[PDB]
Amino acid sequence: MQIHVYDTYVKAKDGHVMHFDVFTDVRDDKKAIEFAKQWLSSIGEEGATVTSEECRFCHSEKAPDEVIEAIKQNGYFIYKMEGCN
Structure with missing residues (x-):
């Protein structure tokens, strides 16, 4: 299974720029x-x-194997790239 890494920029105001990648099987x-x-x-x-x-x-x-299950069950999996620590 090929995980499509979608680097997503979500700009929060004062919290933190939510820089997270979306693991999905969809190519859209x-x-x-x-x-x-x-x-x-x-x-x-x-x-x-x-x-x-x-x-x-x-x-x-x-x-x-981890993300295989996640994307297979939920359709997509978001990982907290930035804002982790």
Whole structure:
């Protein structure tokens, strides 16, 4: 399974620029935006504008067993790249 790494820029005001990558099997940039927005509304950080500039595609790479299950079950998996520590 090839994980599509969608580097997503979500600009929070004073919290922190939410720089996270979305692991998905879908090859749609719009879906990348959509999944991120659904996730933002889910966690509560919906207060950001995601455009074609905010959505970014890095590449597709080999996938560890962990993300295989995640994307297979949820459809997508967001990893907290920045804002972790």
